[PDB]
Amino acid sequence: MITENEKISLPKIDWALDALEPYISKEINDLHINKHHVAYVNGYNAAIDALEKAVGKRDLKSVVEIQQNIKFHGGGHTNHSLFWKNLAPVSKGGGKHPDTSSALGKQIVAQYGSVSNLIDITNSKLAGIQGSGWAFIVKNKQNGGALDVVTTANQDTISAPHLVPIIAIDAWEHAYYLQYQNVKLDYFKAIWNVINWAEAESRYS
Amino acid sequence: MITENEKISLPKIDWALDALEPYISKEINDLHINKHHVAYVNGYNAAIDALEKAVGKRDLKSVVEIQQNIKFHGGGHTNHSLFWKNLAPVSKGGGKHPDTSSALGKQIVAQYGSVSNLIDITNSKLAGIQGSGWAFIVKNKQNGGALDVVTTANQDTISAPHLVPIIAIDAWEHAYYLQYQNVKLDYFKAIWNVINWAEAESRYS
Amino acid sequence: MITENEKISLPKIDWALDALEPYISKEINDLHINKHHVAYVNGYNAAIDALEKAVGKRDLKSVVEIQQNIKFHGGGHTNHSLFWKNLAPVSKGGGKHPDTSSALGKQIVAQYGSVSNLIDITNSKLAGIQGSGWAFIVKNKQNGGALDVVTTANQDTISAPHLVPIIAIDAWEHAYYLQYQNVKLDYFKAIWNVINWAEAESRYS
Amino acid sequence: MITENEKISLPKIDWALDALEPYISKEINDLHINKHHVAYVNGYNAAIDALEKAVGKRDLKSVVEIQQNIKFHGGGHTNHSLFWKNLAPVSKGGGKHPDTSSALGKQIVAQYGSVSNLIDITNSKLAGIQGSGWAFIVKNKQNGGALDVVTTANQDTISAPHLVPIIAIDAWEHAYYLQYQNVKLDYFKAIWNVINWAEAESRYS
Ligand SMILES: [Mn+2]
Ligand SMILES: [Mn+2]
Ligand SMILES: [Mn+2]
Ligand SMILES: [Mn+2]
């Protein structure tokens, strides 16, 4: 029994399916959003509906079973929503580095010395992921807004109340396979050319 | 916003806190039910209440965070509820083996040859558990009601719609530490002297 | 310090890269074996070499870190080795069902009633997998050689001494994406047309 | 085939079994070291011996199975070794806070404002742990030696080459049950009265 202000939907994306070429093919973006993300949107909504029913009648065997789907689709929708938002065509700023005069920029130089180095780290983490997963540049609000590079598995997302996702990078094969196939190393590097750091600076404050 | 027919409570136990001695001390049973299980009952109820709120306003970061607690307390309540139900004083049948003429009994002799052997297996699994967890004798309804011995971690419980828990055995230290301390091997053996197989036969049908 | 009889290598495959069309494209088989499996072969070998070094000098921080890679590449090599072996061109028997007069065949009809039904189950499990993973039809030797359908995550493999993998099915996107993309449901169905049941019957004894 | 410089042993502890009272009973310390830690020491050694054998003959099914035990006992030995080292009798400094003039001290005030607050955080994390696990105050060397409070499950330990454990706190029930039973909240608070911050400052450099 999912209600109006409970259900989610696919977000409006601020760029064209081909606006990220030649770094990300429109064939991927098409399938990824409209195919993969749509599946998560449907999954979360159906999972919530299934809960009001199972919970509504004290069936914990089902309640516990449905939990997984909610973590998966709910985290999937969240991750991809973050993903599109920190992506932009080179035209609209994509690939433009954080300002040496911005809060986020100064923080990267203090902890990592340069945005360049932070990328080598994030890329190493991404290449490290075994199976499906994500990489994040997170801000920890409980230890003085310190930045860190964290890796989640599958659809898991930054859910800790004190953690705030700054940049999300998809490591699922579906994200890069049609264009890069096995060579995920090329995809990890290339994607920085379309990363919307303006959104990162926005999230940092 | 947890409602009446949604919230759970502590189940009525069919034996006295000392009725399982000298296999399980009343000091343990007291703390375990009234202390550990009570904590799970409170946890599940608060977790559900927290959902109607987070879900009610499309806050997936919280929705995903709360998921874990629901799996934990909800699975904890379920496991312990199963646990008390397959425990009984030697007086009330505890420790009495499955009938060689019952469905469950015949199934144990077909797959394991004897209840004796099934116990050595279950005990080996229990001793195998690293950290907190449970052991189960489950009936798989999708492959001809075949029995199997499975091990879950922490509060995880048999949630698969086709799987049916026949016997639950707690492997958490809290279950046996006050009386057996480190020697979990003694606890695993001794507990069979108070296992209510009558409840197992009940669950098998 | 990995030695001769310790190191692994890519197995000789008994069919041509295109012998499984139009169910599995040669473009996939090429990349999968020669690209994905090769990566696992290299991974396991390097992981073992790294151990003799870390273990050789009581560096448990590294020893524990290397453990993961050994589970991953070692399990990856094992899974794919099983995968090729239970695949065959329709010509060489691929897609031919288990004999109603064979041990494995009779076991499928006893537990599942028909090979047909066992496939619907395995397909449901495969579709259930969240993220990367595998599906297996396993024989449990400790409960009377009973068959069951189990799902592992990532490169995890059937390692339990009492469990024996009968059929392995890859659920990683890399296995089916180039040809089926998102529609994994089509891949799961189609792959049965090239499953080598003769190898399954071989493994069952 | 475990060799001399490969095998581990129980470390020499710098305090008496009762030197931590009334915060940690000697009954616990006895059982914990000599009972729990000893079990891990034996586990790691046997696990390594079992590897030289399985690996020595390309049996990956066993190699992958043994991996888990090595992660568990190897991580268990590491965690407890860290644990004793950051524990001390109030006499020998236990409970004495980090110097406002030391590197570690200044870092705690910059990120957390006070050691007091860092403890409330660590305690919240510890209380958050579901099942068996540990809590750590770690120094990340790849982002400017920033401090963070992390929680591992079971015997998992800080293995990341860039992470350095500063303080380890055991969250297993065996650590506090005999004296505090269920009330882990009391144990988490009380243990700070015997935490050896001098060792933390040592690890920070
Ligand atoms: Mn994706
Ligand atoms: Mn319990
Ligand atoms: Mn594969
Ligand atoms: Mn311990």
Taking residue B161's Cβ as centre, other Cβ atoms within 10 Å add up to 10
- Which distant-in-sequence residues (6+ apart) come within 8 Å of A141 by Cβ? A162, A163, A164
Token duo for residue A203: 């999230």
Are B113 and B123 in contact by the 8 Å Cβ rule? The answer is no
Count interface pairs A-C at CB distance under 8 A.
Answer: 53
Q: Burial level of B74, CB count in 10 A (0-12/13-18/19+)?
A: buried
Q: Burial level of D144, CB count in 10 A (0-12/13-18/19+)?
A: middle
Query: What secondary structure letter does DSSP report for C194?
Result: G
- Which distant-in-sequence residues (6+ apart) come within 8 Å of C79 by Cβ? C134, C155, C157, C168, C170
CB contact under 8 A, C121 and B142: yes
Q: B89-205: which CATH number, 3.40.50.620, 3.40.50.80, 3.10.20.30, 3.55.40.20?
A: 3.55.40.20
Identify the helix (H) or strand (E) that includes residue A166. Answer: strand A163-170
- The reply to whether B9 touches chain A by the CB within 8 Å rule is no
C165 three-state secondary structure:
strand
In angstroms, rounded to a whole number, what is the distance separating the alpha carbons of residues C81 and C95? 19
For every residue of chain B, DSSP letters joined together read ---GGG---PPPPSS-TTTTTTTS-HHHHHHIIIIIIHHHHHHHHHHHHHHHHHGGGT-HHHHHHHHHHHHHHHHHHHHHHHHHHTB--GGGTTTPPPPTTSHHHHHHHHHTSSHHHHHHHHHHHHHH--SSEEEEEEEETTTTSEEEEEEEETT-----TTEEEEEEEE-SHHHHHHHHTT-HHHHHHHGGGGB-HHHHHHHT-
Documented resolution in Å: 2.6
A36 Cα–ligand 1 center, Å: 6
For every residue of D150-197, DSSP letters joined together read EEEETT-----TTEEEEEEEE-SHHHHHHHHTT-HHHHHHHGGGGB-H
CB contact under 8 A, B64 and A74: yes
Are A200 and A166 in contact by the 8 Å Cβ rule? The answer is yes
Are B190 and B95 in contact by the 8 Å Cβ rule? The answer is no
- The reply to whether A127 touches chain C by the CB within 8 Å rule is no
In angstroms, rounded to a whole number, what is the distance separating the alpha carbons of residues B75 and B172? 14
- Which distant-in-sequence residues (6+ apart) come within 8 Å of A41 by Cβ? A8, A9, A10, A73, A77
Domain D25-88 has what CATH class? mainly alpha
Identify the helix (H) or strand (E) that includes residue A35. Answer: none
Strand boundaries in C64-201, DSSP class E: 133-140, 146-153, 163-170
Identify the helix (H) or strand (E) that includes residue C65. Answer: helix C60-85
In angstroms, rounded to a whole number, what is the distance separating the alpha carbons of residues B122 and B137? 8
Are C118 and C149 in contact by the 8 Å Cβ rule? The answer is yes
DSSP bridge pairs for C163: C140
DSSP bridge pairs for A139: A147, A164
Please choose, from the candidates A154, C67, A146, the residue with its C-alpha nearest in 3D space to the C-alpha of residue D138.
A146
CB contact under 8 A, A174 and C174: no
In angstroms, rounded to a whole number, what is the distance separating the alpha carbons of residues C177 and A131? 15
In angstroms, rounded to a whole number, what is the distance separating the alpha carbons of residues A125 and A129? 6
Please choose, from the candidates B5, B116, B134, B144, the residue with its C-alpha nearest in 3D space to the C-alpha of residue B80.
B134
In angstroms, rounded to a whole number, what is the distance separating the alpha carbons of residues C92 and C168? 18
Q: Burial level of C25, CB count in 10 A (0-12/13-18/19+)?
A: middle
Taking residue B204's Cβ as centre, other Cβ atoms within 10 Å add up to 21
In angstroms, rounded to a whole number, what is the distance separating the alpha carbons of residues C11 and C64? 29
Taking residue C174's Cβ as centre, other Cβ atoms within 10 Å add up to 18
In angstroms, rounded to a whole number, what is the distance separating the alpha carbons of residues A69 and C127? 13
**Rounded to a whole number, what is the distance in Å from the CA of A191 to chain D's nearest CA?**
22
Q: Which residues surround ligand 1, an ion (CB under 5 A)?
A: A 170, 172, 175
For every residue of C131-149, DSSP letters joined together read SSEEEEEEEETTTTSEEEE
**HSE toward the beta carbon, residue A200, CA cutoff 13 A:** 31
Give the per-residue SS3 of D12-64: CCCCCCCCCCCCCCHHHHHHHHHHHHHHHHHHHHHHHHHHHHHHHHCCHHHHH
Are D68 and B128 in contact by the 8 Å Cβ rule? The answer is no
Please choose, from the candidates B6, B68, B15, B12, the residue with its C-alpha nearest in 3D space to the C-alpha of residue B37.
B12
In angstroms, rounded to a whole number, what is the distance separating the alpha carbons of residues C2 and A132? 30
Are C63 and C51 in contact by the 8 Å Cβ rule? The answer is yes
Q: Which chains touch B (3 or more CB pairs under 8 A)?
A: A, C, D
Alpha-carbon Rg for chain A, nearest whole angstrom, is 18
Token duo for residue D59: 């049996």
Angle between helices A173-180 and C173-180 (to 10 degrees): 60
CB contact under 8 A, C147 and B149: no
Taking residue D51's Cβ as centre, other Cβ atoms within 10 Å add up to 23
A149 three-state secondary structure:
strand
Please choose, from the candidates D123, D109, D142, D129, the residue with its C-alpha nearest in 3D space to the C-alpha of residue D173.
D129
Query: What secondary structure letter does DSSP report for C34?
Result: I
Q: Which chains touch A (3 or more CB pairs under 8 A)?
A: B, C, D
**Method by which this entry was solved:** X-ray
- Rounded to 5 degrees, φ, ψ at D167 are -135, 130
- Which distant-in-sequence residues (6+ apart) come within 8 Å of B183 by Cβ? none
Distance from chain centroid for Cα D159:
12
Distance from chain centroid for Cα C24:
15
Token duo for residue A194: 């379309």
In angstroms, rounded to a whole number, what is the distance separating the alpha carbons of residues B70 and B46? 9
Handedness of CA A65, A66, A71, A77 (dihedral sign): positive
Question: Which of B143, B159, B163 to substitute to test the interface with C, most C CBs within 10 Å?
Answer: B143
Query: What secondary structure letter does DSSP report for C75?
Result: H
- The reply to whether B140 touches chain C by the CB within 8 Å rule is yes
Q: Burial level of B47, CB count in 10 A (0-12/13-18/19+)?
A: buried
Single-letter amino acid code for the residue at D20:
L
Question: Which of D70, D179, D182 to substitute to test the interface with B, most B CBs within 10 Å?
Answer: D182
Report the side by side order of strands in the sheet with C146-153: C146-153, C133-140, C163-170
Q: Which residues surround ligand 4, an ion (CB under 5 A)?
A: D 170, 172, 175
- Sequence ranges of the domains in chain D: 25-88, 89-205
Token duo for residue C14: 């008994």
- The reply to whether C58 touches chain D by the CB within 8 Å rule is yes
- The reply to whether D172 touches chain B by the CB within 8 Å rule is yes
Query: What secondary structure letter does DSSP report for A92?
Result: G
Token duo for residue B123: 């005990």
Please choose, from the candidates B189, B197, B75, the residue with its C-alpha nearest in 3D space to the C-alpha of residue B132.
B75
Q: Burial level of C165, CB count in 10 A (0-12/13-18/19+)?
A: buried
Single-letter amino acid code for the residue at A185:
L
C114 three-state secondary structure:
coil
